[PDB]
Amino acid sequence: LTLRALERGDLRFIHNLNKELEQPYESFDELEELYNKHIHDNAERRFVVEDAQKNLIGLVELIEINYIHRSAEFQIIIAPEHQGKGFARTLINRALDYSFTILNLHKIYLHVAVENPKAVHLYEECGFVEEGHLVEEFFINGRYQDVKRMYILQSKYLNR
Amino acid sequence: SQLTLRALERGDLRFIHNLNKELAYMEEQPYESFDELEELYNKHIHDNAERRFVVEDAQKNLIGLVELIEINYIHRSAEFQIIIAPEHQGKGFARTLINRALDYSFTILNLHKIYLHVAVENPKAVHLYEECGFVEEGHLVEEFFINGRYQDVKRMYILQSKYLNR
Amino acid sequence: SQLTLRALERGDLRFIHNLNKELEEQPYESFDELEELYNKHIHDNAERRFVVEDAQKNLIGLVELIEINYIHRSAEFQIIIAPEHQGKGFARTLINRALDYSFTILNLHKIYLHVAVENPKAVHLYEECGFVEEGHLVEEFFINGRYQDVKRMYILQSKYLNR
Amino acid sequence: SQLTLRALERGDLRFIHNLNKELEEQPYESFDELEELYNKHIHDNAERRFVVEDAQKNLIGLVELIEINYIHRSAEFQIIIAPEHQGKGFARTLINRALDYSFTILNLHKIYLHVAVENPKAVHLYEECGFVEEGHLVEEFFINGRYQDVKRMYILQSKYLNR
Amino acid sequence: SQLTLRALERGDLRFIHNLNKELAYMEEQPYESFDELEELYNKHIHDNAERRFVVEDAQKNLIGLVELIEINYIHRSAEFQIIIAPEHQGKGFARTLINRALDYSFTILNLHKIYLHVAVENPKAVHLYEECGFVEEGHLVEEFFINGRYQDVKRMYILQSKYLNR
Amino acid sequence: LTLRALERGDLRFIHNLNKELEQPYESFDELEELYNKHIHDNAERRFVVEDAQKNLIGLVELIEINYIHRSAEFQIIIAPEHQGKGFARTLINRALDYSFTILNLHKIYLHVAVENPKAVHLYEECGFVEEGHLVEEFFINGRYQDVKRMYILQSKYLNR
Amino acid sequence: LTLRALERGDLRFIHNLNKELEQPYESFDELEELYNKHIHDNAERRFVVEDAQKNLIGLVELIEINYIHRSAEFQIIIAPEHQGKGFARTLINRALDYSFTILNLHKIYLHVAVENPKAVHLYEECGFVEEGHLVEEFFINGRYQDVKRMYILQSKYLNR
Amino acid sequence: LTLRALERGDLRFIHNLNKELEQPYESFDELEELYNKHIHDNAERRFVVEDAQKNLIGLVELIEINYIHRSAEFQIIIAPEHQGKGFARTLINRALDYSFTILNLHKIYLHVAVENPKAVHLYEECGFVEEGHLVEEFFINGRYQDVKRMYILQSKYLNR
Amino acid sequence: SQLTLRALERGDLRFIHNLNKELAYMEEQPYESFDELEELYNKHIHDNAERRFVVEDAQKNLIGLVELIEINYIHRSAEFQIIIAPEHQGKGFARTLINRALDYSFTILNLHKIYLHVAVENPKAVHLYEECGFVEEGHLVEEFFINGRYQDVKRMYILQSKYLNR
Amino acid sequence: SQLTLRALERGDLRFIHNLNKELEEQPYESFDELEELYNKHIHDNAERRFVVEDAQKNLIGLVELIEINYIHRSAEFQIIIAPEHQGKGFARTLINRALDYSFTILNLHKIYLHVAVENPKAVHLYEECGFVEEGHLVEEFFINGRYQDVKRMYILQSKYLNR
Amino acid sequence: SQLTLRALERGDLRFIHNLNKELAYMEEQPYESFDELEELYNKHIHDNAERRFVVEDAQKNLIGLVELIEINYIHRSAEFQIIIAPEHQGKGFARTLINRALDYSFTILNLHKIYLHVAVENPKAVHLYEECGFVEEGHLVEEFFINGRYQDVKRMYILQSKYLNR
Amino acid sequence: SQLTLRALERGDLRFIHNLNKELEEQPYESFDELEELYNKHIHDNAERRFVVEDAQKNLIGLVELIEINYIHRSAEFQIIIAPEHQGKGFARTLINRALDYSFTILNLHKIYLHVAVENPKAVHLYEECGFVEEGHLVEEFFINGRYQDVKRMYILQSKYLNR
Structure with missing residues (x-):
């Protein structure tokens, strides 16, 4: 599974992917125009994970990147087809690998419902x-x- | 629940234009130009004070439209509107889409009050x-x-409160 | 008759342009001016331009309301019928169709128009x-x-509503 | 009374801003937002904001009409009186002054408003x-x-004109 | 002929605003905002379909305003409007400014017809x-x-023709 | 032969029509952009003359329209194919008819080389x-x- | 002490007020232009606290306002002159009063250094x-x- | 008498100067905005003639400059104060001097009422x-x- | 005279780009991007200080390019440039296109002087x-x-003068 | 070799984007950012980006010059070779091709570059x-x-011209 | 530490312009136009890749300028520049402002490396x-x-690391 | 001499305009064209316009470099001296001052200029x-x-640096 940057061509698929059970009720035109507004936004990163046969497994995102504090919020979403295949661990560490070895961030945090x-x-x-x-x-x-x-x-991710 | 709500988009405007031409019809201006409809749509893509949802069945046959306008985020209020194509007006889809809109208003959008206007002669x-x-x-x-x-x-x-409490 | 009052949109300007060539300067108007002027008035609430057609989508004519005031609730009514249906008896139908819209929908008080004394x-x-x-x-x-x-x-x- | 209905213009926004601080979010509104929002509605025919003052140019209050439809000929009326003249008896004067403008000039059919049940x-x-x-x-x-x-x-x- | 016509300009808008507040008064909206008046003026500086003239005396005391609107250059027609401050309404300046406007319309602007609207109750x-x-x-x-x-x-x-022929 | 208003669709033909023996050396992109600049220019009129089979006979133009003096310069160009067919007289009076009966102009003038x-x-x-x-x-x-x-x-054209 | 909305006129004072011991190193032109960019930003509120003699006591801010979750981050800064006068409690509840009684928010959170x-x-x-x-x-x-x-x-602030 | 280029500062005087017995009825705001539109217009020249004591004698203009045909229309206006002082001849040749010795034009033409x-x-x-x-x-x-x-x-002006 | 001059247009830019890649070559930057060439072209469509002409034969086979740049209309001067595809460099088209450009410069554009720069080592x-x-x-x-x-x-x-006088 | 130095244009960005995915953030760069950033530097005379290809139009690599000063006549040289031709011996060819352009055409005085000490x-x-x-x-x-x-x-x- | 760093602003550009005219001077273009300096400043107000700080004493006498340019937030690097008016070059303010800039770079901006370029002949x-x-x-x-x-x-x-560890 | 080479800025255009009136079209140039054309070239790196003045801030003349190529490292030099100091001997001083900037700062290779044969x-x-x-x-x-x-x-x- 490879980590690729999300481009305008992938917007249609993620729009249907968001429809799961806020985002499910978003207009595609709003999704596209908002994507156009954040093309050069250095405070966020939008990556699509795909397999060898270029099938969209999911989407991993980094938002609220500070660069002074070197922190960023992490988000991930896997299509219902690939939930139980055990990809989550790989994609998580794939995003942590980019954050800590390429982007040179210090901290990665995330929010999860206590009822999960x-x-x-x-x-x-x-x-x-x-x-x-x-x-x-x-x-x-x-x-x-x-x-x-x-x-x-x-430091913890690098000194595993 | 065989129907599905979906955010309105440019590709559905032509259907909405033909749909608004009702005779059953409380629709003020069914004599609106498609260009006025499209340009006004483009001006409200990021308008967080409205929510327009297209209704479609399993085979993606656009049934009607459900709207939430005048969304005030201090008073947590919004006006509700609904239109169903004359083809399916009698199949009882209305109360399903009404309850689906209220669910989105009260469980997702976290609104406090949903009101609407109806002609007394209807x-x-x-x-x-x-x-x-x-x-x-x-x-x-x-x-x-x-x-x-x-x-x-x-x-x-x-x-x-009433909606979220049986 | 089985005619309908539809809103003039950009998709009809080509047919209207060819129709404008009758026997005003409109017959000698470039289509590019017609289209760009149409774009400038898409949101002009002081005007209305409706295409009148039958069940077979055949354009019978074009009714227009301009100089809409909304304080005085008046407007100038203009009408044109395709040369094909000029003597078929649609004029009275489209006229009362324009008065129905003006008085039962837009809630106007007065509809006036200009007619050549030589007609x-x-x-x-x-x-x-x-x-x-x-x-x-x-x-x-x-x-x-x-x-x-x-x-x-x-x-x-008041006169039209109390026929 | 010897009051006059003047159009709200940019030169009064400063006084209005200080007046908005009463006891809505308007008391906590930045003047820059008030001025820029005013500029955006200078040509908004769906609203009217009039300053009511006496012969000595003293601002007594502010009457407003919003949500003007022009098809239904309705509008929401809002009123505010400076804390100095709240109990002096100008409320009835400015109310009938706003109804006079709505019904004898703008030619509106219905004027509605919201009043707190707790008042x-x-x-x-x-x-x-x-x-x-x-x-x-x-x-x-x-x-x-x-x-x-x-x-x-x-x-x-009809009710206001036939008193 | 002690009065003089002069092209309206931004500096006179404040006078025009105070002037339009007449009680004698056929003036639709004397409740217009000065900002709406100024911005609308800026939008019609190059509008060749109108001509607005300020009237002033020898000492440059702005008396009133004379306007030619809806100037059509194919039909050579234009609507005429005039307003005189209540201070000088009784000094008979009207017929002087009316004939001065007609002179400009027929001898300079080369118009064919000048019309106007008047309330029957005046x-x-x-x-x-x-x-x-x-x-x-x-x-x-x-x-x-x-x-x-x-x-x-x-x-x-x-x-x-009638004007240019005694 | 009918008198039709020139539109962007006719620009390609007149560009080749101008190539006869200033305008012959004009870039089509300049011709088109200049046409776009004068869409609403009331001081000029650009008409294309065509026959019953919609064949571009020529182009008649009115420029420098004053409306105060009610004068305008007249220009005409006939494709080499239809020069000797005697259309010039018809197109000239066709343009004079529009100028004097529709546009309500007073004077129409033109320039011609003394060596013609x-x-x-x-x-x-x-x-x-x-x-x-x-x-x-x-x-x-x-x-x-x-x-x-x-x-x-x-007056002279109307009182023939 | 009254709670007033911050306007462009107060920018010069807060610029010097920020200079205490990120913001202290901000250019005034950046501060002003950023203020102009957030005039109509409904996701933030900027209030200046002043006494009866219109002396700038401090600044209370609400940022990251959601309106769906009805949460917002709270921030406060008091000029060094009025730190020990015990105004903090008043300004805090003044901001909580606006958030819970006027803006109708549900949650107000803030960040404070553990070393304070x-x-x-x-x-x-x-x-x-x-x-x-x-x-x-x-x-x-x-x-x-x-x-x-x-x-x-x-609920807690209202049911004191 | 010197020949100076007209600048925005001279617009107020020429506006009153135009009022003599079209231009007399022009709004100053139209005059100024039209002047701003023709700042870089190489097809016209606007010169103000002034004496040693910088008193505006009149205005000489060159319009419709072609550069291919090297022709241009000439216009002149003298304030009523200096009409009978015999300056016209000087200003005319001053404009012809600029047209033929500096701008390198070939022909200068003008229009005058036959009733003058x-x-x-x-x-x-x-x-x-x-x-x-x-x-x-x-x-x-x-x-x-x-x-x-x-x-x-x-050739004629140079070979006097 | 079997060749014909024709005003350059957008459709020919791709040919010009491939043409400028010469090895025979006094061409400074044959390493220019087509996008820079196209955008710079769009910026000079109405530049009356230059004239760029494409050369084509009877069958409209683009031979080369002839340019007049730095056209000064006070001094009636302009710089001349010419490039011919390596395919037809030896067929003697140069002196035909040189004289054709001079004819346009002196008989149509009414210029007084035409100059050019040439490498001494050519x-x-x-x-x-x-x-x-x-x-x-x-x-x-x-x-x-x-x-x-x-x-x-x-x-x-x-x-x-010299050109117009044998 | 029979390689040529061509100017990078928009038509190649797609191939470059796929090529950028090697083993910098460029591999994780959205194509839309690559294209829009390319548009912003079309007229940036401080940079040069050339595509190196053979007679068969096969892209061998990409040579770049950035931080061009023109007063000091210096520039940073960067090079990348497609993974297919990394060990084929084109590196020395493209390097001397970039130095030929810098010193015999653009007339630069100094070409510097950064190389990982771990290489x-x-x-x-x-x-x-x-x-x-x-x-x-x-x-x-x-x-x-x-x-x-x-x-x-x-x-x-001087050193490159006097080999 | 009697000096104070302060973010550069428009009001100080005139001082910076006169300051850059040094003869002591490694300053490339002291022949820059104030308008070019001001407009370039306006274009970099929100440039997060640079930090320009004016140095002033207790009485707000602008001493010099300290700059951090080419700030890269992945590599945590930035170039350092400093200029002191010839009036105070000998009072030893340099090492104070150098250490003050490094403190801001390493304790506030959280940079990893600060480099600079110096003429060998200085x-x-x-x-x-x-x-x-x-x-x-x-x-x-x-x-x-x-x-x-x-x-x-x-x-x-x-x-x-070295800076934060004595 | 004790002259200095300062950059021409907007604050000097008025003096330059009056100075341009000598005995080119510049004497007959509107100041508004001079100022707007100046604004358009503030960032034009192909030109340089320096004001030459003495210790007393008196403008002696104006030296200019235009058509700067940066690849060929050439530029056209132009000079003008105020009528007051035309025969005082500043010409040679300002000329060598312009060559010093061109050859010791901007690092140009060739400076050319046009001089009337009739002079x-x-x-x-x-x-x-x-x-x-x-x-x-x-x-x-x-x-x-x-x-x-x-x-x-x-x-x-090379010739100027090896005097």
Whole structure:
């Protein structure tokens, strides 16, 4: 599985990929114009993961890149077809590899719903550690829910 | 739930234009130009004060349109509008799309109040929204000029709390 | 009749341009000027340009409302019928179709129009359609190498709604 | 009274900004946003913002018409009086001054407005000025850490002109 | 002829704004914003379809305004408008400025017809224009909404040939 | 033969038509962009003359339209194929008909090389009269040449 | 002490106010142009606190306003002259009052350096509660430092 | 008397100077904006004539400059104060001097009302010769009038 | 005269780009990007200070290019440049296109002087222009850097009077 | 060899993008950023980007000159060879082709470049091509999760022209 | 530490222009136009790749300028430049402003490496930077053309780790 | 002399405009054209316009470099001296000041200029300043109603640096 930069040609597929069960209700024209607005935005990175047969496995994103503090929020989404194939670990470390060996970032953090303990333990297996329990951070499905903020530092990923 | 909501996009504007030409019809200007419709659409792609959703079935046959306009994020309110093609008006899709819109308004968009305007001389629509949980909060006197005469319209609402509590 | 009032859009300008060549400067208007001027008035709420067609999508004519005031609730009505259907009897149909839109939808109070004094049959046709002379504009327009008079005829909303 | 209805212009925004600080988000609005938003609506025919003042150029209040439709001929009326003249009895004067403009100049058919249900004296004042309740909007606005109800009251042109 | 016509310019807009606030007054919107007046002026500086002239006396005391709008260069027609400050309305300047405008229209601008609209309920203005050579060509029924009622207005004209021939 | 307004679609043909023996050396891109600049120019009129089978006979133009003086310069060009067919008279009066009966102009003038006495007499047959002999007005083919300025008024054309 | 919206006229004072011991090294022209860019930005609020004699006490800011989740980050800065006068509590609740009674927000969170336990306890007195301990979040004075993320909800502030 | 290029500072004076007995009825804002539009217009020249005490005597203009035919229309206007002082001859030859010795033009022509025989003879004294009698060219004071088109060539002015 | 001059246009830019890649070659930057060539062309469509002409035969086979740059309309001067594809360099088209350009410069554009620059180390071109009427007016020392060394170039001219008089 | 130095144009960006994916951030660069950044530098006289290809139009590599000063007449030279032809011996050919353009056409005085200290064979190849070490930049770039040193090597016009 | 760093702003450009006219002077173009300086400044107000700081004393007497250019946020590097008015060049302010810039680079901006270029024929500056912790990493041969001859320049650096560890 | 070479900026255009009125079209150039053309070339690296002044800020003249190539490293030098100091002996000073900038700062290779053949003293002055005739342009410029010849004189960097 390779890590490629997302380009305008991939927007149609991710638009249908977002439709899972905010983003599912986004107009494609808004998605495209917003993509055009962030072409040169150095504060974000949008990568599409594909296999040898150029099949879109998922999307890994880095947002809120600071460069002074050298931190960035991490996000990942895998198409329903490839959820249970065990790609998550590979894509996570693939994004951490780019963040710590190429972009030279110091910290990578992410948010996960407290009501998804399987996802929490997954990131724990990839090296992430809980640093916060945000109370009623996001309003998800008719109710406010807590989310875990988990992080991992450059030194730890490099000294595995 | 065999129908699906989907964000309106440029490719559907031609369908919307032909759809707005109804005779059943509370539609003010079915005599709008497609170019005015398209350009006005382009001006509201990033308008976070509205949400327009196309309704389509399993085979992607565009059924109708559901809209949330005048979205105020301090008062957590928004006006609701819905139109269904005359071909499927009798198949009972309305109350499904009404409840689907309310679900998005109250569970995703986190709105507090959803209101709508209905012509008093359309009791079929009034009683329908009542079944879907809407309650009358106003009887606007001579609010809209419709077919050569001023007519009254009901303003009806539904609150987030009531919807999220059976 | 089984005619419909559709909004003029860019896709019809080509047919309108060829139709404008009748026997105004419009017959001698470049299509590029017609299209660019159309684009400039797409959001001009002071005008309305509707294409009238039958069930077979055949363009019968073009009805227009201009100089819409919205305070005085008046507007100038103009009409043109394709040379093919000029004497078929659609004029009265499209006229009452334009008055129906003006008085039952746009909620206007007065619809006026100009008719060449040198066209008595046209003046008397509008009178049969409810219009009434309110002015005899002397040498208002220069038409065919000669200044001509035009009748200004009007119709009020109350009169049309209480037929 | 000897009050006059003047058009709000850029030269008054500073006074309006200080006046907006009462006890809406307007009290907490940056003047730069007020001025730039004013510039964007200079040609917005769907709104009217008039400054009401006396013979001595003293600003008594600000009357506004918004959501003007021109097809339905309706508009929302809003009013604010400077804290100095709130209990002096100008409210009824400026209200009938706004209805005079709406019904004798702009030729509107209906003027409606929202009044907090928690302000009975205000609701009954508009009723004395000819308005009538047509709606009781439940939890329409979030005011002072609490959703409040508002009365929607209207007045028709025919009623105001035949006093 | 002690008065002088002069092309309107930005510096006179403030006077025009205060002037339009008349009570004598056929002025539709004396409640216009000075900013709307100024910006609309800037948009018509090169509009060859209008001519706006400020009237001033020997000491450059701006008396009023004379306008030619809707100038059509194929039909050689234009609408005429005039306003005089309430201070000098009774000094008979009107017929002087009316004939001065007609002179510019027919001897300089080379127009063929000059028309104007007058409220039927203002006979003082109607008979005044008649004296200046204007003739009635129309009695427009309920043309303008004025002070809570639709009112008729006279449309009156004068031709270049008649003016240039005593 | 009908009188039609020139549109962007006719530019390619007139570009080749101009190549006869200034304009012959004009870039098509300049011709098109200049045409775009004068779409709404009320001071000029560009008409293409065509037959029943929509064949471009020539081009008649009105430039320097004043509207105060109600004058305009007249120009005409016929493709080499239709020069000797006697269309010139028809197109000239066709342009005069539009100028005097539709556009309501007062005077129509034109310039013709003094070394083209056949063209001078042609316009004399169509009603034009010499009003000037401009000395060395234009530099044509390596030498300055005189041109006749000929005119015709609205009253004369209407009272034939 | 009143809460007023920051306007272009106050930029010069806050520029000197920022100079305390990132922002202290910002060009005034950048500060002004960035202020012009966020005039209509509904995702932030910039308020200046002033006393009865219109003296700039400090600045309270709300950023990252969501409106769907109804959360926003809170920031406050008091001029060195008025630090020890005990205004912090008033300004904090003044900003919470605007967020919960006017803007109708649900959650207000903030970040404080773990090496500032006095500030932590202050927000604890104003109703804030720790929800996270971000490890090496910010690089402050030649070293990465931890910060506490503290929050307070609308229901709690209203039901005091 | 010196020949200076007209700049925006002189617009107010010429505006009042134009008011004599089209231009007298021009708005100053139109005059200024039109001046701004022709700053770099190489097809025209606008010169103001002034005396030793920098008093605006008049204005001489060259318009319709061709550069291929090397022709240009000449125009002159003297303030009423200096009409009878005999400056016209000087300013005329001053403009001809610039046209033939600096701008390297070939022909200079002008239009004069036939009902101004004194002006016609003046240009005849300065070297101009009648080349046309334009019938009813301009509509002046309620009637169409004829005008003389008079010219003078570069070789003649240089070989005086 | 079987060849024909024709105004350069966008459609010929690709040919010009491939043509400029000569090895025979006094062409400074044959390593120019087609996009730079096209955009620079778009910026000079209305530049009246240059004239670029494509040369084509009866079958419209683009032979080469003839240019007039630095056209000054006060001094009536312009620089002349010409390039012929290596395929037809030996067929003697040069002196035909040189005389065709001079004809346009002196009989149509009405220029007074046409000059050009030639590398001293290209006597074939120098003597060719001499035959076409050009005369040397300067031997510019180390004017251009060409292939790792500064080289001299001849500046040669021809006047309108001489050309128009056999 | 029978290679040619062609100017990089928009038609090649797609091939370059796929070629940039080697084993810099360029492999992870969106094509839209590559194309828009290319458009912004079409007229940037401080850079040169040439495509090197053979007679069969096969892209062998890409030579670049950046930071061109024109007062100091210096520029940084960069080179990349397609993975297919990396060990075929084109490196020395394209290097001397870039020096020929810099010194015999653009008339530059000095050409420098950076070479990873962890690539001795590369440093010694440039030395064989006439370059000479003038700097050992300590921890200049962060490459592969580690700050690496780079040799800065230069070559003067006079030396290349007098081989 | 009586001096203070402060972000450059438009009001100081005139001082910078007069300051750049040095004779002591490694300044390439002291013949730059103030308008070019001002417009170039306006184009880099939001350029996060540079940091320009004006130095002033207690009484706000602008002493000199300190710059960080070519700031790369992946490699955490930046070039350092400094200029002090000839009036205070001998008062030893340099090493204070050098260490103040390094402090901002390593403790606030969190940079990893700070390098600079110095003319070999200015040993006073070379040895000064050495005292401030800079170390030579390159002797660039004929790097800059200075006063009619190509001259060498030292490239010297200092790392964040060394600076933050006594 | 104690003269200095300063960059021409907008603040001097007024003085330059009055100075341009000497005995080119510049004397007859509108100041607005001078200022707007100046703005368009503020970042034009192909030109240089320096004001030469003494210690008392008195403008002695204006030296200019145009048509700067940077590949061929050539440029046209132009000079003008205020009528007040034309015969005072500053010409040779400003000429060598312009050559010093061209050859010791901008690193140009050749400086050429045009001198009217009808001004022998000027041609011989440049020859004394190191220039040499390389062309006799026949009827290059139309000056004072007559086409005049101009000498094109040059000077190389190597010659000026090795005086």
